[PDB]
């Protein structure tokens, strides 16, 4: 719950989390 999935309309969505200050697109 500490991914945030950012919902960008550009047609893609990314779990950014400062964790590792990176959006990331593999599937966790």
Do not use: F
Request: charged share 35%.
């Amino acid at each position: 719950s500490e991914w945030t999935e950012r919902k960008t309309a550009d047609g893609k969505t990314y779990y950014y989390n400062n964790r590792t200050a990176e959006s990331t697109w593999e599937k966790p």
